[PDB]
């Protein structure tokens, strides 16, 4: 017998103790080992009720993410009042690594196996493992990144998609690369990201179809944010160690979606970011020398829907949505805490 | 104790911007958004937007986009309306609200339990 | 989205005001006083809750999609215009008129 409990769950990963990656790095001191033999319990019969949006494991994460993240980065300079602080700032090796999250004695983490669970609701197939699968904790605004895809057909997840309020989360069933790269060697800062506009605009296609089936039959158009800090009105992500901000404009097109090879979003490297932990501002040293590159899977996007919008016929949707617990929640849907009683 | 502290009403010529703060007090202001409400003559009450204080991130019904900007200066935990190239009809007491449920983790941004006492803005010539 | 009636109701204190908001989509629904020249002041949410120091003459109920705030025992301080709302949408309101 068990009941909805939270616990202070602790984590896993493949970590290597030589590394000099800021994540194994971490990972050495904050997790134990992967599970070297994980085990995974199908409970039959049994129908569980999960909330990704109020999931305690969620939280959890964020507090780690934002403890490597604390720990990992070497900004120059560190904004906050009031308080200028200024330290110095070589560059790091940054790469995400899978973390597990597992539950310590007398606890255990359902795990949602219905193919097109949308995060919230009842499960009817519901196993119990002693870890979730190894999360890549990837901070990135607009797309996600690097993620699992869905199973079958792509899926809206939205704690209510009446409520413009809420973010939705559009869960990719096929990836589509991003291939970001400041070239070797004008402006240094300049780079840009590659999308093959082809793939892009079918999966496209299939999220607006998606959407579609949620909003009546409204006509589904995007439109590019409405406002907010750079961090959120461009894909915003860290591509070895460097800030990329990247505009999406060409990646929402409508009348694509109604023709395209490669996409080219024009991105800058900003030494000057906004913090995602918390309120302040960083000042990093110049973009690394040589060719910097990123190749990325989307396995999802972030959306806000427009408000209001009782006369028209269309619903419309911006990119980004949310905050960073919501790139966590992409990964952790599938699971809840339960204490054994 | 929750509060919203509207600054006072203003008098615009039309062509003119305004801006209305509201300043807030009482609670994390990260954790749940700003939103504003305008109750104009014949209008009864319409919501103009919400604003997430964590990156500025907004909501602006098609009839105020390009006309409406929500932002904040998180510093002094306040939020901000402004709107640009005033006409008449913009003749409204403009309230900023929030949510009765706002926690570290969770919000439900429409039952207004907070209300601003609300800003005048004439419009005139 | 939310159709109120009826526009207005003019009543004498001790009787009971009874307010219809009719919905078209869905969400929890909200009941909203606003008393001349102040702001509004949430009085139901989600159909039958009552916010912080609203008496318990202010009732609110749910019939499909038919709701209704029901003010028992009016007082002269109930004059005022009520709205319901639900997330960004608000009905046209309905003016209450009493007084002593």
């Known amino acids: 017998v068990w009941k909805d409990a939270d616990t202070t769950l602790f984590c896993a990963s493949d970590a290597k103790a030589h590394e000099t990656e800021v994540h194994n790095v971490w990972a050495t001191h904050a997790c134990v080992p992967t599970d070297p033999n994980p085990q995974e319990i199908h409970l039959e019969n049994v129908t569980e009720n999960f909330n990704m949006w109020k999931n305690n494991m969620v939280e959890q994460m964020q507090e780690d993410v934002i403890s490597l993240w604390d720990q990992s980065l070497q900004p120059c300079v560190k904004l906050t009042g009031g308080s200028v602080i200024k330290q110095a700032c070589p560059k790091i090796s940054f790469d995400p690594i899978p973390i597990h999250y597992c539950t310590p004695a007398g606890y255990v983490i359902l795990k949602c196996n219905d193919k097109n669970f949308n995060g919230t609701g009842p499960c009817k197939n519901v196993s119990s493992v002693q870890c979730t699968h190894g999360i890549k904790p990837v901070v990135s605004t607009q797309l996600l990144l690097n993620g699992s895809l869905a199973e079958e057909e792509i899926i809206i997840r939205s704690e209510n998609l009446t409520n413009n309020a809420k973010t939705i989360i559009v869960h990719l069933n096929k990836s589509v690369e991003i291939n970001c790269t400041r070239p070797s060697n004008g402006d240094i800062r300049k780079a840009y990201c590659e999308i093959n506009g082809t793939k892009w605009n079918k999966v496209l296609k299939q999220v607006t179809e998606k959407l579609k089936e949620h909003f009546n039959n409204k006509t589904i158009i995007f439109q590019p944010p409405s406002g907010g800090d750079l961090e959120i009105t461009m894909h915003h992500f860290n591509c070895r160690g460097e800030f990329f901000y990247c505009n999406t404009t060409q990646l929402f097109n409508n009348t694509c979606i109604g023709c395209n090879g490669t996409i080219t979003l024009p991105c800058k490297i900003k030494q000057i970011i906004n913090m995602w932990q918390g309120t302040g501002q960083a000042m990093y040293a110049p973009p690394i020398d040589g060719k910097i590159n990123c190749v990325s899977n989307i396995t999802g996007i972030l959306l806000t829907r427009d408000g209001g919008a009782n006369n028209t016929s269309n619903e419309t949707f911006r990119p980004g949505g949310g905050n960073i617990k919501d790139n966590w929640r992409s990964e952790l849907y599938k699971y809840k805490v339960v204490q054994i009683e | 104790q929750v509060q919203l502290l509207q600054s006072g009403a203003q008098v615009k010529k039309t062509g003119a911007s305004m801006r209305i703060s509201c300043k807030t007090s009482?609670?994390?202001?990260?954790?749940?958004?700003i939103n504003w409400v305008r109750q104009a003559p014949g209008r009864g009450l319409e919501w103009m937007g919400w604003?997430?204080?964590?990156?500025?991130?907004?909501n602006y019904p098609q009839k105020f986009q390009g006309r409406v900007t929500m932002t904040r200066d998180m510093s002094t935990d306040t939020a901000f309306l402004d709107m640009s190239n005033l006409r008449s009809d913009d003749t409204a007491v403009y309230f900023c609200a929030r949510g009765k449920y706002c926690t570290a983790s969770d919000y439900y941004n429409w039952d207004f339990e907070h209300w601003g006492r609300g800003t005048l803005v004439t419009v005139s010539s | 989205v939310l159709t109120q009636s009826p526009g207005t109701l003019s009543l004498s204190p001790g009787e009971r005001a009874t307010l219809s908001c009719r919905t078209s989509?869905?969400?929890?629904l909200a009941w909203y006083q606003q008393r001349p020249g102040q702001a509004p002041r949430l009085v139901i949410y989600?159909?039958?809750s009552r916010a912080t120091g609203i008496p318990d003459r202010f009732t609110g109920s749910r019939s499909g999609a038919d709701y209704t705030l029901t003010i028992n025992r009016l007082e002269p301080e109930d004059f005022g215009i009520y709205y319901c709302?639900?997330?960004?949408?608000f009905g046209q309101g309905t003016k209450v008129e009493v007084d002593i």
């Open positions: 709302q639900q997330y960004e949408f």
């Open positions: 604003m997430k204080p964590r990156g500025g991130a907004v």
């Open positions: 009482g609670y994390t202001f990260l954790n749940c958004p």
């Open positions: 989600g159909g039958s």
């Open positions: 989509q869905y969400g929890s």
